[PDB]
Amino acid sequence: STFGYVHGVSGPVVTACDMAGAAMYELVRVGHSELVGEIIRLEGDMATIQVYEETSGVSVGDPVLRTGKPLSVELGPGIMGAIFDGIQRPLSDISSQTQSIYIPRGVNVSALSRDVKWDFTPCKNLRVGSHITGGDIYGIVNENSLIKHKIMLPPRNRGTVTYIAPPGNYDTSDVVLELEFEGIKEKFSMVQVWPVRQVRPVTEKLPANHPLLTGQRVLDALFPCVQGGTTAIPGVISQSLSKYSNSDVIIYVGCGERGNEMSEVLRDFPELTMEVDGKVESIMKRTALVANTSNMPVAAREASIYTGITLSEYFRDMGYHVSMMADSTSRWAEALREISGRLAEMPADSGYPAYLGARLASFYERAGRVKCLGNPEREGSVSIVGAVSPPGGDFSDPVTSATLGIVQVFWGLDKKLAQRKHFPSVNWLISYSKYMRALDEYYDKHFTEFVPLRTKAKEILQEEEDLAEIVQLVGKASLAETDKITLEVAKLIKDDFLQQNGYTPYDRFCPFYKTVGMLSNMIAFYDMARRAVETTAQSDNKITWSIIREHMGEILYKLSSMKFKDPVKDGEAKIKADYAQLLEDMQNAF
Amino acid sequence: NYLSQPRLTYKTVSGVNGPLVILDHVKFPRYAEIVHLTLPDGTKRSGQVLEVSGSKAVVQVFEGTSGIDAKKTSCEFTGDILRTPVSEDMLGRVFNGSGKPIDRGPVVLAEDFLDIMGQPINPQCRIYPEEMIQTGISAIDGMNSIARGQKIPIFSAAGLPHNEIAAQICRQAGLVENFAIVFAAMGVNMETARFFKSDFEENGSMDNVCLFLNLANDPTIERIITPRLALTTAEFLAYQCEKHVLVILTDMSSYAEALREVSAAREEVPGRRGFPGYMYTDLATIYERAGRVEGRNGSITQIPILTMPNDDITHPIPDLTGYITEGQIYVDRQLHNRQIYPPINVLPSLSRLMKSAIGEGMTRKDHADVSNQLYACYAIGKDVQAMKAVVGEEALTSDDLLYLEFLQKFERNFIAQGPYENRTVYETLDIGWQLLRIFPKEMLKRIPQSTLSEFYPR
Amino acid sequence: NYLSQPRLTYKTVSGVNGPLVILDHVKFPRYAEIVHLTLPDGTKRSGQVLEVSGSKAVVQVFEGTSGIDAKKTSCEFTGDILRTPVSEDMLGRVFNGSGKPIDRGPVVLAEDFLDIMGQPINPQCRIYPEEMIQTGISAIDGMNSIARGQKIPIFSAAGLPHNEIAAQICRQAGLVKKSENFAIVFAAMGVNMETARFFKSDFEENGSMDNVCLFLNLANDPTIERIITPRLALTTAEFLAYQCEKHVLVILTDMSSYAEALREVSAAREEVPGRRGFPGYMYTDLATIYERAGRVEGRNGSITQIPILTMPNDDITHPIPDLTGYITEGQIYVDRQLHNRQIYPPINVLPSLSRLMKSAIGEGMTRKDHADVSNQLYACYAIGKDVQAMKAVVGEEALTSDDLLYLEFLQKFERNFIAQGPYENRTVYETLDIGWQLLRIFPKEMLKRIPQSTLSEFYPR
Amino acid sequence: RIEIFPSRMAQTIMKARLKGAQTGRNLLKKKSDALTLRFRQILKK
Amino acid sequence: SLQTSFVTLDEAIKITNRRVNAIEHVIIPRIERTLAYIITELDEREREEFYRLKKIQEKKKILKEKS
């Protein structure tokens, strides 16, 4: 029956009568300005609609036309380097079309520009008359020098090729492919429309084995993350993922961001260039932003999370490695508390809805290393890093407590380390990672030194912690000598290894050979000094750490200056670790 | 353009409870539509439609439901939403919380009528604040510096001098250019009203102060539209006739109390502590109207004051404002009992836009490191001050006595300055270096040697 | 007792709100019926009936409500309750939450159909547990040993390896060699993608899969299926035990993730939440699945439970480790103190306790010295923990020669007895031999918990 | 005498303050036993 | 040598015996009756949330009965 009539509106929710053959979560267009809405409850003839835009001035009796399709995004060329809102309207194209500074809340601009021409090529191993199923790489379009946007068939359908396009320039609306099925010849363009609440089909899920090199030294050594994993931080910092973070495309979903802090994201990203092959290339060629501030309506906060993960699964299927950074899921979670109160639903603890842990589970578990659909047989991965409430409700908070039952990695940023300006403020006691059994196959092959060091480095950091409560009560005067050798090396770990400056031009990204390099010397220093005091005890005149700490003052300076080697060495940086190691072997021969 | 249809007038009120009037038999009612209530005495009250269903319309009145009849009260429906008359004569004029004059002036003579909800700013064409606003207070300038176009609240309590330090940073606006001051005062006393009214005319600032206010004898439903009437004139001056506006919103807890009173009358599903679940959305729609845009050169800066109840930062009002706004200023009661002025506890205070406001081009060079160390010694010195009472006075280090001497020097020389000192930023950092020189070398770990070598031997 | 009447198909949906679909004009609806939803595009969804009121039948769809029309969808009422197809051939098969196979396998041929809720056991016919279950972990077998029919949770937190010791005590469980009909039903509830793939790659690829009945339930598949998952797992563990007469060890993880599924369907029924959001009937609902254990009078099989749950914010006052403390029989603690010390399994034995370990161990059951070597290893670890702090605050020289010996005991107790590695299956005799090696470093007349009738043999070696 | 406001987070904070105070007894009582034991054996000397 | 060790020990074991009892009598009971105040004040918020949510459900049956 095509149309509806507004029966009532109270804020975002709109009740619409004469809506009989309407399905749940369809998109409707309410009002004379055609505000985008979504059916969230239907009772007989009347349907309840949450609107993604502001319903100020909607009257009773306005038409509600239904579209017969759920909330979906357009997937095709013209999407890298773009900036969208929650419902995927391009903020860069909508300011050039209207020439104002406002969003007119009635403007149905297409997400991908149908005017820009893209140079299409075919698979080359695909003839006419070939059979083709969903997920097959059908063509290749180069949007930039970095990204080869592989055109793929949608995973719903199947057929036989009757027409393929010659290599040339086409729009996003030109027909590129004809497929013959049993019934009807069907057209195909360079864009596909996929619902954001529906998980994208794929061949078979794979275990994650390769690590994600964050660049931070505590994050890569103690609590490592993999590509295809799930991470949660209590959070722009993040440019380590932007310049390296070894993944092919990056997306960034700002959900509930502040206005002058969303403005700092979309101002420096075009002019934050990285290194690839000696060429100084900008990260915006492999970045796409979903910008949703807190001024924007509440139903778009829910759509902005599902928009991002749908784009992230889309570039997963081409064979790329996607790293998605979802910023604040406490805001996303708050939209869910706001909408559930407007539908008169019953709350769970602290006013949040009862399905809070299920909505987070349907988003975090869309990430993983996985073999994609289609005949060219490629493999992709999606990594998700989501932010939660930063200083409060430490492990008992409905957003944080529901997240930790899902995610595998949790880099707990401490406020007490941040008050003393210890950066990064990831504290090592409550943080964890669960990809430690999955990475020992990689760590026994490529960096075989590492595993007995990280086992011992975590012991020294807690041996200081169990002894830090001793010194603040009774004092350092009655401390032992196997204990004072922990309090100096662990303090050497917290200042050299764990501390890292993100704006300093050599500590803004620390590669993994540099991380294993300086860690292997700070624990060999711990093992040799343990060796000196223990076997030579109570008979031989061996130093009880007081004559060592002044005599190693040049050598302890070499350990503390080891975080200064750069990008202007790899060979020189490797041999200097072996230089400082053979320096210590002479000292222990005394 | 102009609407020329005659307004319908219904004598069909069917419920009155609290602030809300319920109508029936209304023909096609709009949402957020302004209604004019004519009492049986002949007095006129305004209104705003909060909910429609079929022929039923729920309208909240702005002046209260006292004396509203069921048979004899007539209300006419104005076919559009609430629009404020905005013009460049409102600078230097005093209205009330509804936009009606108080200072014996005439009605407003607008060049245009602007919607109180405003238009949503496109995030792509919004430029990022980097120019630092000096306030003259070393607790604000040195540690938590404010950019030009930054939303930054003042977290206070009941009985603390937040109004005294608000007027101080209102008359000292720095920028090392005649800030146009829009002042919304919601739920203030008469003594709070006469404090701000007399202070602005004492300095001659009321040539360009657009103060309009709402006392406690005034009804509470005027406090809902009072920030929205404040920012729809402040963005007429920042974004359309390019002034450099500075908006002060007090008290933002008295606005949320009026929001809870309406949501309790509508029998809504409450959030934390009875406040509505949409309080995060309502506070963000009057906070995010700040910043500056790329085509204009005017800007709008928001300093919304709010007194949190029972000294609780985990209350729903100062917690939700911590998520929207870009760093808070924490007025402390413990420093106020020690007779310290700007009792600003700098340890939970923050300014997230302070990184791009300081450096080489804007302030002098050592700003990023002296404030990084003045925070650091204050954080450890407050920690050893709690250990001075528990275990011992002379206990467990001689270096703690330097930390307990830093506390007497920080709270009495840096932050305590009096209500008329206009310190420049170079005076602020040089005062902070005088408190850092009582510390010796190789404890100043946040300051690099490229900047420590100049200012320690001074 | 066959039902032979055909099934009715209703096209009469009236309301959709949340997971619930409201139907009208239903002909005599039963309360817990399974229904089949046919979508307008042809996709099939299942669902239970949540509430029936005269003609109205309120069903809740399992897989979600998205796309359900008001005019074109068609509900298919199956007249019966949810029944579990049970057999012995569900041993070495991976099933998902609801009922379905996961390792590309066939549907089970099902020599009986059993109700998932079951019926409560007779207290008069439930006999007391006596024999021991061997888990292969010295922190469990030596110190806090479990009986045949005991229920005993493992109290952990997030990030701690409680899933790595869940897969361990399923991979190397046995009844004691004693010189026999053992199965394991594993219910994995609310696990991740990586925790689900870890469980299949373990059991299967370790050879344990001749007696495992492993039931997955991930975080994607619906939250209503988390409720029917341990009812499914204990229905198959009541058919193998005292209907096929074998000893079954049931592992339920995570039992903290069960209750948020219990909290979610509670608010779907518009029920007012109790203390801390969890419903008031949670002590009854945890009792329906914890008390399906023990051994009975005229049957040789038994069933014992290890419900593994994580306490939130390390708080035992939380109702998830509190309501299981009123009903189960001792706890095992996974602590973050030993986990950060790189000790696996990170089990501390001072606050841990097994309330039925006096019955489990004994002369015929493991051997005679088990009651005294565990009492002595608990005593020396408690005293050795006290002198471990006096080395810090008093001095290494001020402590005597005997207190130095407790220092050298604790360094070898946490590294040789407790720490064992994820693949070392120490039997209960190898456990006590390691325990006697750590007691032999002490001289005589300090081992006051061991009588001289057993101390004379096992000490000289 | 009470100190701060109840939030569901202060309870974990106050239990952490109680935990240090519970171990501030036994770690300091045994010091007062180590001092008194030498104080009693010096008096016999 | 034993005289000057004896006289400085009891004046250093009195200051340790006071620091124990100041914990046992002044600090530990103050934290414990603070913690008792956290429990009863958090239980009083749960009854306020119970009364509000039950009142919504009572009003939701009123509108359902007429409609």
Tab-separated table of N, CA and C in Angstrom, chain A residues 73 79 289 560:
chain	number	residue	atom	x	y	z
A	73	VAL	N	24.124	0.681	2.716
A	73	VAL	CA	25.164	1.567	2.218
A	73	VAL	C	25.502	1.191	0.784
A	79	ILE	N	34.966	5.927	-2.362
A	79	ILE	CA	34.671	5.772	-0.948
A	79	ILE	C	35.913	5.945	-0.072
A	289	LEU	N	36.468	8.112	6.601
A	289	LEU	CA	35.960	8.537	7.896
A	289	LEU	C	34.441	8.496	7.923
A	560	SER	N	69.733	3.206	29.057
A	560	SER	CA	68.707	4.241	29.040
A	560	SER	C	68.711	5.069	27.762
